[PDB]
Design a protein around this ligand. Structure first.
Ligand SMILES: [Mg+2]
Ligand SMILES: [Zn+2]
Lengths: 284, 52, 91, 1119, 328, 57, 113
């Protein structure tokens, strides 16, 4: 239940990485291990040479406090970095627990590969099962799909030539955009809003390539999301596997989700302006 | 369509001795009205030299 | 959308069965290639610029268009499952 | 153009210099201009005389006397221009005259010692620290002094607190315990204060005569009469009641530490604590604090009055004499001068301890300058305060108004011991005393709500953070031009009128007059009013005063519009708003953005960058112009000349426009024709539709400059040489790279193009033998060189304008250690209005451009003129911002009358006035219409009949006057343009001032397919190189699993985020055009397993049976 | 409300594709007719009824009386404060009712009144603020000021009144900035405590149920009355019948999911006075080990049909609980 | 026994969710005193390990 | 090849810690500024946590795909990525016992109960 040999984390989990000018930024774990090693070696030397009892007890106390600090900091005093930087050191328990620890970032997958984000503008010309996607960011998002599809044709010989062709926008061709339209014929993408209060904050859509910068959004989902058009942005993700494509297109597509899960009240209801128009046209 | 200056080397510079910036010069040139008298004629290159 | 989703939902008890059926059909189409289809002769999907939906622009729509016919049968255990599930992943 | 003003009020006083707070604070802090002999001592000289005269009586070499005489500073090393070009600090060296004295013979006086360099404030009020310029914002906290607060539990009694500073010092409390105890905790332990009172030399006879005479709670101290007659042994007893374990024979050790200098607050005499003393209680607090050391015994001037007055409150009632914690009269503002002074004196005390030690081990005496004082502590402390402090924050130079507001912003948080971000909900709300001193609307929405604010326009801090509101003296029935400045406490006692009350000039014109008794809206008679408000503008900040029709707007919308005023980018051709408030000229003048004629004279020469003007004195002076200066936030600051050669000017007249000034008027935005009607769906909820007319002529366009920087630094591999040559391949695109490393000016650049050609070493310890031997047999000497060269980041690029190179050959520049050179390249582009951009009015009607329509199909008037911007009415009733409607009506009147209008915020134009103006405008409009011989269109006829059926226009009138009445409503007929048929029912149209808001990468698409991954976890995040991914959080995870989505979440957690082998295999497969493989365990979980393993824990994955299955391939197993 | 009912009925009786097409057509035509119809907001559209004028006079008179009622010592500070609050809160409602009476009588096609009558934008409180008066304004202490706001945004507020309303503006801002945090924490607690519950199940042999009442036990000290239609719908819709019930000559067989029609029929029957409590299945009695059975769970989804076996009810339940919390 | 939502969330048979929720220290200590073989039921655990969710598909 | 079904968490015996780690660290010397390579037996040692380089060993004689598994001629390193330094673990043999802080400071003191 008490520990005799203390494990030492693999170096890459606490790497010393040079920042600039030879200086090295280090994880505090390295400092804690260094202090522990120094205390342990001092204990070994002191016990080897001679035993002044009070001194031996004192150095035992320092070793014990070093181990305790390494396991976690704060429960007994606050061992800190070198004086002048009064930031308490970060220990194992600090890495695990907390509002942003190991648990609250690997539970989360804070980073994804094929993602983008942009401001959103209304897309009234669109049907409900569609959304507008800027051609440049869509081209970037489907890059492997684009490479494969234009390799199906003779636009480029190999993948490296195609990537170098796409690596600069001065080499774009209308054949490239034809291929991009070819890729996304049946594909869907997930549109997402940052505060995801309920199940409808993620919705799949059929992308439509547009010329512009903003994301064109069907107005009827203006209430499914709490998304007005006062400058708020949305993110977009691109599922890869065919199995995931089927999932999104069948049970996440906005055309199939018209009623709340909180109650039978519809959320695809006509919004403010449509209501105004229909009331105007059906009044006596 | 296009503007060339013997002195400057980009759009956001300024000519010494000129009160207006290059931006102002281009904006003023934007309102210049040119009437062609030969319908077959397509592209013309007017020249301007001034001092003092 | 897709041809008659209402008909799709009517002909299965629960939607997740429908999703797994359509996607497993899509995976079968991918692995065997699009030769193992059961709507081949006349009614095939078609692109606009050319006839590209003959081969493989989108397999999910292929599977769903397949399922609207009576040529697809699905069940919890209709075939010895072990044989198929251990030949599927090695090709 | 004319300008018509509507407000009918005489501003007796004009605005004080809107930036005088910081200017006066720093000018009082630094007395360099005044002779050192001058009486002025507060500030830096106060710190010098307070701590610097170190004395040492008997410690080794006794008689150490290091005294202060004078100080001076007069020569900055460099002017600020290159100090921004080169990352220096616009500072001045500091010198001090000191001298050393001993009890023996010897008077070793050193007139000059250099001790640190202190930053010098620029003219506007900013500081340049390391190239960039920052601003130190004021802070607000508790005023030092005496306060009384009710007991937290006991409802009949209360407590008294006297609060000095710093924290590691006194904080004294008096409390009453009913058993007959007058308890007093000095620092941490309570104490019967009667012993200390006896220490003060007070006997019980005068204690009853002067203190216990009135109150019956004197028995709470007169009961303790046993130890009430101990003159001096009470000092020993009191020190004994302390627990240091030390001998009691230390008469003035801790007894006197609350004496003169060390502990008790040195607050400014008269007011900082003395007004908090004398005004609160008693008559006068002579000296700085409570102390006596001329006879060893002690004297008091605080404890006795405080106890007396406390007992008066708890027994009798002098008044409702309990002090509000948040009352503005009990709160004080530490300006930049106070913060700088305090940090300076902390560094000075550090230096004092250092010199104490240096004397301590020093042997001889002829060592005054060198062996005593070292500049490292004080200089480092000042540099740290000006660089890494919380309140010294980056300047917000997006536009002159932004800079002004940032300079006059008051913050509640600060160093940390005062208030923090976690818990402040009690104090975030406004107080009744903010009226006229703090703008109740200026606060920024978000976490820092209510904590950060800005003082009102007419506000003025007098000498110690005590905001004074101007007021006009009212004597009898006459309002005198006399203007007197009240603090909160001073105002809390009189009756104050309101600026809107009817006035006969020098006589009140009303019978029942509104007033504020004590923050209470009451109605009184004119005879009972003593003071009057100068002007309603004194109630709101500078930024809010620019919104024209505040009287018809909601506080939320007014707040958010006032915030958006700050972040409006200056346009290429920006113009003054059609409706102004009247502070535009003051804002552009006081914020030093333009150039003005300092004296009567005539212009001599005016060029694109410099103006030479010969004054009436015969002296000619040259003014240079920052032609295209990059802002802090990336905009462009230009001075455009506004005078011609040989043009007479007046004193203080305009010479050159600022970045956002039309003619001495704050111009940040445009004046456009707006039609308030719902278009198809393009202005759906808050989106905006704009014409292409605003783009065919550049009307919303802005120059944006990006400043790239790349360094060559000395490595152990060897110095990295910035050379035009490219190591391996790229030479075709090198054509734009003309000279050695730096790209040629004026050359357009695309993303992925070289800007600076930098070369590093091929190998860290050994280069590639292939390429090494390559270059060896081509050119004898090898080339151990790898390509690490700055290229345009993916995205966008414009035109290179400037390139600066700083090398080791330093003229006056310094570089980071190990860095041989640095080159900075400026690339500018002309951003044009497009869909992604956003606009806003001054009333907060936030919007985003949704579609640009071609000119033909947008609605147009009966005349050929088409409207510019179409706005959705749905946003008006949901919020409450009717100000924009009034602005639209005024703009409609002005567009035809060709004139501008100035209306004060709470003295604007009455509805009859604007109606009459619209009548004149319609007269002009329809008279011009008839001059060409046209009557009324049939479409207009049917629209009129429909409006008649809707009750808009009275029936029975000819179309002429019916349409005139419709115009009086501000609504005119429009034609759809797409159909030609008119829009059924009238439409409201006018002119609004719409500004383009700040537009960074927020619109730009951080869309990536593959980017840099982190080191600890392989979750992809880039930044400078690549955008990085998007957070998928947990709420998105919860929603994703709320559906039946199972594999989607699996792929998005492993295949696309963490599984390194999984993601590599997936990328290869999709390139190969085959289905993605099944995922594996994410690396974040392996990190978790190893982290748990680091502790004494042990986690392993088990199979269906108790058989561990190793997550790792074989790496966990040994050998 | 009519549009919402129309959409729900179309979804019930037609399905997915036709409902989506109906929504598309409705959106397109609503946009076109909103454009061609030309609804705009002018300053004169915020009409001020003259009747409120004399109302104010009356109220002022009353206040004077109440004020002299204080100067004779008949009232305490608390009594006077409560009287003033009651008087002003009554006259505010009087004025708002007068405003809508004016709008319906005179100008049916007023853009503000039109927007309020439809579900487009606005509330009667906001319209009263625009045209009438925003009388009672809250103090930072949580109480309300004695002196109300006489003017409205059609007119111009006095400086003092604007400073007063700034109190409420700041209160709203801070309350957003903190209650959002609290509600998010609550939602996280919910989603953790419920994440285990997913419907994987056979119909559990639950011979148990819950009896949903139809009458409020106590609105007066002793009185029974039928519950509101909204409560009954939110308690019964999508539930599964515990045991067979026949109330109005109609045999509701045991195990029949309750649609909207069934709930309306039951409400009508209870109005006639035949039954008071409905026995229904519920998760509260489900005997499934981890999760709930299909029957014990119910019928409500994004669809109408009974729930598919295998979808996480716990997480959607927690999200449904937490979502309105941000807007409370 | 009726307890608040927090205590019920904490005291659960699976330790992964409890450790992930409120206080990792106490939860991990308790689950380390006695070997808690966490069964992979409940969605949070399967998300943590990255395996396929029991719910949904 | 088997699927993960359960996750067991338990205490670690001292012999467990010895079995996990590959060698012991004695020097508190991370890395010298001059020698960018790992310094000593310290917290970043090469042969205690695996090679820091990509694929080559210290010398590189027996490295190639015909004979990667054959023990190196002048060396003893099996071909592997840097990922070994992500997973290979160290240990410290304290001359004196110590207690895990959790079991002594948790609100229910496991040692204390
Ligand atoms: Mg928004
Ligand atoms: Zn059940």
């Amino acid at each position: 239940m008490i520990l005799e040999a203390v494990p030492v984390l693999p170096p890459d989990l606490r790497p010393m990485v040079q920042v600039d000018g030879g200086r090295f930024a280090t994880s505090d774990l390295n400092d804690l291990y260094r202090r522990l090693i120094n205390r342990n070696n001092r204990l070994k030397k002191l016990l080897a040479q001679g035993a002044p009892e009070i001194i031996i007890r004192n150095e035992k106390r320092m070793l014990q406090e070093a181990v305790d600090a390494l396991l976690d900091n704060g429960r007994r005093g606050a061992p800190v970095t070198n004086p002048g930087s009064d930031r308490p050191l970060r220990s194992l328990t600090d890495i695990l627990s907390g509002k942003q620890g190991r648990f609250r970032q690997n539970l989360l997958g804070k980073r994804v590969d094929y993602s983008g984000r942009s401001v959103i503008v209304v897309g009234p010309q669109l049907k409900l099962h569609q959304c507008g996607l800027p051609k440049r960011m869509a081209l970037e998002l489907f890059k492997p799909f684009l490479l494969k599809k234009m390799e199906e044709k003779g636009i480029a010989p190999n993948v490296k030539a195609a990537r170098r062709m796409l690596e600069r926008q001065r080499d774009i061709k209308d054949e490239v955009w034809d291929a991009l339209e070819e890729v996304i014929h049946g594909k869907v993408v997930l549109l997402n809003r940052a505060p995801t209060l309920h199940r409808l904050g993620i919705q799949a859509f059929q992308p439509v390539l547009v010329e512009g910068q903003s994301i064109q959004l069907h107005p009827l989902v203006c209430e499914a999301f709490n998304a007005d058009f006062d400058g708020d942005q949305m993110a977009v993700h691109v599922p890869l596997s065919s199995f995931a494509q089927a999932e999104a297109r069948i049970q996440m597509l906005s055309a199939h989700n018209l009623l709340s899960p909180a109650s039978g009240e519809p959320l695809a209801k006509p919004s403010r302006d449509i209501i105004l128009g229909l009331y105007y046209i059906t009044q006596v | 369509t296009s503007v060339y200056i013997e002195d400057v080397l980009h759009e956001f510079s300024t000519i010494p001795g000129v009160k207006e910036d290059v931006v102002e010069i281009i904006l003023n040139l934007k309102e210049l009205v040119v009437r062609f008298l030969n319908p077959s004629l397509q592209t013309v290159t007017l020249l301007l030299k001034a001092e003092g | 959308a897709e041809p008659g989703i209402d008909k799709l939902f009517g002909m299965v008890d629960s939607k997740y069965r429908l999703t797994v059926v359509v996607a497993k059909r899509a995976q079968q189409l991918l692995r065997h290639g699009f030769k193992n289809t059961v709507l081949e002769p006349e009614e095939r999907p078609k692109m606009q610029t050319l006839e590209g939906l003959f081969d493989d622009p989108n397999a999910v729509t292929w599977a769903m268009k397949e399922l609207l016919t009576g040529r697809l049968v699905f069940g919890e255990n209709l075939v010895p499952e072990d044989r198929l599930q251990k030949e599927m992943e090695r090709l | 153009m004319e300008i018509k003003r509507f407000g009918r009020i005489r501003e007796v006083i004009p605005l004080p210099p809107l930036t005088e707070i910081q200017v006066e604070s720093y000018r009082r802090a630094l007395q360099a201009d005044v002779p050192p002999e001058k009486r002025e001592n507060v500030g830096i000289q106060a710190a010098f005389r307070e701590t610097f005269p170190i004395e040492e009586e008997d410690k080794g070499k006794g008689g150490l006397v290091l005294d202060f005489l004078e100080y001076r500073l007069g020569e900055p090393p460099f002017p600020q221009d290159e100090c921004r070009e080169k990352d220096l600090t616009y500072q001045a060296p500091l010198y001090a005259r000191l001298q050393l004295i001993h009890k023996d013979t010897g008077l070793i006086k050193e007139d000059e010692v250099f001790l640190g360099h202190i930053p010098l404030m620029t003219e506007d009020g900013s500081f340049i620290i390391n190239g960039a310029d920052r601003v130190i914002v004021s802070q607000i906290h508790r005023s030092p002094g005496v306060y009384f607060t009710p007991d937290p539990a006991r409802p009949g009694r209360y407590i008294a607190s006297i609060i000095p500073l710093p924290k590691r010092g006194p904080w004294i409390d008096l409390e009453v315990e009913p058993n007959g105890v007058v308890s007093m905790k000095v620092n941490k332990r309570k104490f019967p204060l009667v012993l200390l009172l006896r220490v003060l030399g007070y006997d019980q006879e005068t204690l009853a005569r002067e203190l216990g005479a009135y109150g019956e709670l004197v028995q709470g101290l007169m009961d303790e009469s046993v130890f009430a007659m101990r003159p001096e042994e009470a000092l020993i007893r009191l020190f004994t009641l302390l627990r240091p374990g030390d001998p009691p024979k230390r008469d003035k050790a801790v007894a006197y530490v609350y004496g003169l200098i060390a502990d008790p607050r040195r607050y400014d005499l008269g007011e900082a604590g003395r007004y908090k003393a004398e005004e609160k209680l008693g008559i006068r607090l002579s000296g700085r604090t409570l102390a006596r050391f001329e006879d060893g015994e002690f004297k008091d001037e605080v404890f006795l009055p405080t106890l007396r007055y406390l007992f008066a409150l708890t027994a009798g009632v002098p008044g409702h004499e309990v002090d509000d914690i948040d009352h503005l009269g009990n709160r004080r503002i530490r300006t930049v001068g106070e913060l700088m002074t305090d940090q300076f004196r902390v560094g000075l005390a550090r230096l004092a301890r250092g010199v104490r030690e240096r004397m301590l081990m020093g042997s001889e005496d002829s060592l005054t300058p060198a062996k005593l004082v070292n500049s490292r502590p004080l200089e480092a402390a000042i540099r740290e305060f000006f660089s890494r402090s919380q309140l010294s924050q980056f300047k917000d130079e997006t536009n002159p108004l932004s800079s002004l507001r940032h300079k006059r912003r008051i913050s509640a948080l600060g160093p940390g011991g005062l208030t923090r971000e976690r818990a402040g909900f009690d104090v975030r709300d406004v107080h009744r005393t903010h009226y006229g001193r703090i703008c109740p609307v200026e606060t920024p929405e978000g976490a820092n709500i209510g904590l950060i604010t800005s003082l009102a326009a007419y506000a003025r801090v007098d000498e110690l953070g005590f905001i004074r509101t101007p007021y006009r003296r009212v004597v009898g029935g006459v309002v005198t031009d006399e203007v007197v400045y009240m603090t909160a406490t001073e105002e809390d006692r009189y009756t104050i009128a309101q600026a809107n009350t009817p006035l006969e000039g020098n006589r009140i014109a009303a019978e029942r007059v509104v007033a504020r008794r004590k923050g209470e809206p009451v109605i009184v008679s004119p005879e009972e009013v003593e003071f009057m408000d100068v002007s309603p503008k004194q109630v709101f900040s500078v930024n809010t005063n620019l919104i024209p029709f505040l009287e018809h707007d909601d506080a939320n919308r007014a707040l958010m519009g006032s915030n958006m005023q700050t972040q409006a980018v200056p346009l290429i051709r920006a113009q003054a708003p059609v409706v102004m408030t009247g502070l535009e000229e003051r804002v552009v003048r006081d914020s030093l953005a333009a150039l003005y004629a300092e004296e009567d004279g005539e212009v001599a020469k005016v060029d694109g960058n410099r103006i030479v003007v010969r004054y009436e004195d015969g002296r000619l002076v040259e003014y240079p112009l920052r032609r295209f200066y990059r802002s802090n936030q990336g905009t462009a600051l230009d001075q455009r000349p506004r005078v011609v050669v040989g043009q007479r000017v007046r004193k203080g007249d305009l010479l050159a426009d600022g970045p956002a000034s039309e003619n001495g008027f704050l111009a940040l935005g445009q004046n456009v024709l707006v039609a308030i009607m719902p278009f198809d769906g393009y202005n759906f909820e808050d989106a905006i539709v704009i014409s292409e007319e605003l783009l065919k002529r550049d009307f919303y366009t802005s120059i944006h400059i990006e400043r790239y920087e790349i360094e060559a630094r000395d490595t152990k591999l060897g110095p990295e040489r910035i050379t035009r040559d490219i190591p391996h391949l790229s030479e075709a695109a090198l054509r734009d790279l003309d000279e050695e490393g730096v790209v040629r000016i004026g050359a357009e650049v695309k993303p992925g193009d070289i800007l600076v050609g930098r070369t590093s070493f091929k190998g860290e310890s050994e280069p590639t033998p292939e390429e090494r031997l390559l270059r060896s047999i081509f050119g004898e000497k090898a080339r151990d060189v790898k390509d690490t060269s700055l290229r345009v980041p993916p995205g966008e690029g414009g035109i290179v304008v400037r390139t600066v190179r700083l090398r080791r050959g330093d003229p006056g520049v310094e570089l980071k250690p190990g860095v041989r050179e640095v080159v900075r390249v400026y690339v500018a582009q002309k951003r044009k209005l497009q869909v992604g951009d956003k606009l806003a009015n001054r009333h907060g009607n936030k919007g985003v451009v949704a579609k640009i329509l071609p000119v033909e199909d947008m609605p147009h008037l009966p005349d050929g003129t088409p409207v510019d911007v179409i706005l959705n009415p749905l946003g008006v009733p949901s919020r409450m911002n009717l100000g924009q409607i009034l602005e639209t009506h005024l703009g409609l009147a002005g567009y035809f009358l060709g004139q501008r209008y100035i209306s004060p915020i709470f003295d604007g134009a009455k509805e009859p006035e604007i109606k009459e103006l619209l009548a004149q405008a319609f007269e002009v409009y329809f008279g011009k219409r008839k001059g060409e011989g046209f009557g009324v269109d049939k479409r207009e006829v049917e629209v009129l009949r429909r409006a008649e059926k809707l009750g808009l226009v009275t029936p029975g009138k000819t179309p002429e006057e019916q349409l005139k009445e419709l115009f009086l409503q501000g609504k005119v007929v429009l034609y759809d343009g797409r159909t030609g048929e008119p829009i059924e029912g009238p439409i409201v149209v006018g002119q609004m001032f719409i500004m383009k808001l700040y537009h960074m990468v927020e619109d730009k698409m951080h869309a990536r397919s593959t980017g840099p991954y982190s080191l600890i976890t392989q979750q992809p995040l880039g930044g400078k190189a690549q955008f990085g991914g998007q957070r998928f959080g947990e709420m998105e995870v919860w929603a994703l699993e709320a559906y039946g989505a199972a594999h989607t979440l699996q792929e998005m957690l492993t295949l696309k985020s963490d599984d390194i082998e999984g993601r590599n295999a997936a990328y290869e497969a999709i390139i190969k055009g085959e289905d993605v493989p099944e995922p594996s365990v994410p690396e974040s979980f392996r990190v978790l397993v190893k982290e748990l393993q680091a502790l004494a824990l042990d986690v392993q994955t088990l199979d269906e049976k108790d058989n561990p299955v190793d997550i790792f391939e074989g790496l966990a197993s040994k050998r | 409300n009519s549009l919402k009912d129309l959409v729900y009925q179309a979804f019930l009786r037609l399905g997915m594709e036709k409902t989506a097409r109906l929504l598309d057509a409705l959106k397109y035509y609503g946009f076109t007719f909103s454009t061609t119809s030309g609804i705009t907001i002018g300053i004169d559209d915020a009409v001020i009824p003259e009747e409120k004028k004399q109302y104010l006079e009356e109220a002022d008179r009353k206040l004077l009386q109440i004020e002299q009622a204080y100067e004779m010592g008949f009232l305490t500070d608390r009594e006077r404060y409560d009287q003033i609050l009651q008087l002003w809160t009554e006259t505010t409602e009087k004025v708002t009712q007068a405003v809508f009476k004016n709008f319906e009588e005179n100008y049916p096609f007023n853009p503000l009144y039109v927007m309020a009558q439809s579900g487009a934008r606005g509330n009667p409180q906001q319209i009263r603020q625009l045209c009438g008066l925003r009388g009672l304004m809250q103090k930072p202490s949580g109480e309300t000021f004695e002196v109300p706001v006489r003017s409205s945004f059609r007119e111009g507020l006095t400086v003092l009144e604007y400073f007063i309303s700034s109190h409420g503006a700041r209160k709203g801002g801070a309350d957003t900035a903190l209650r959002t945090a609290d509600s998010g924490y609550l939602t996280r607690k919910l989603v953790d405590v419920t994440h285990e519950i997913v419907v994987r199940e056979a119909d559990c042999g639950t011979t148990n149920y819950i009896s949903v009442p139809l009458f409020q036990p106590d609105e007066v000290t002793r009185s029974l009355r039928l519950r509101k239609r909204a409560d009954i719908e939110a308690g019964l819709y999508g539930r599964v019948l515990a045991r067979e019930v026949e109330v109005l000559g109609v045999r509701l067989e045991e195990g029949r999911y309750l649609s909207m029609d069934d709930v309306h029929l039951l409400i009508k029957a209870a109005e006639a006075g035949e039954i008071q409590e409905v026995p229904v299945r519920s998760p509260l009695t489900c005997q499934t080990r981890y999760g709930v059975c299909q029957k014990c769970y119910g019928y409500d989804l994004s669809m109408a049909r009974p729930v598919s076996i295998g979808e996480a009810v716990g997480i959607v339940a927690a999200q449904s609980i937490g979502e309105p919390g941000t807007q409370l | 026994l009726l307890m608040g939502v927090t205590k019920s969330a904490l005291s659960t048979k699976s330790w992964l969710s409890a450790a992930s929720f409120q206080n990792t220290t106490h939860v991990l200590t308790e689950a380390a005193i006695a070997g808690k073989k966490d069964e992979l039921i409940g969605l949070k655990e399967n998300v943590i390990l990255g395996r396929l969710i029991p719910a949904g598909t | 090849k088997k699927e993960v079904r359960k996750v067991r968490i338990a205490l670690a015996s001292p012999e467990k810690i010895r079995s996990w780690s590959y060698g012991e660290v004695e020097k508190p010397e991370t890395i010298n500024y001059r020698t960018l390579k790992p310094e000593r037996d310290g917290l970043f040692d090469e042969r205690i946590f695996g090679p820091i380089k990509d694929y080559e060993c210290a010398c590189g004689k027996y490295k190639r795909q015909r004979f990667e598994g054959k023990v190196c001629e002048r060396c003893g390193v099996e071909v592997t990525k840097s990922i070994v330094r992500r997973y290979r673990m160290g240990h410290i043999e304290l001359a004196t016992p110590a207690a895990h802080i959790w079991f002594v400071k948790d609100v229910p003191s496991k040692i204390g109960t």
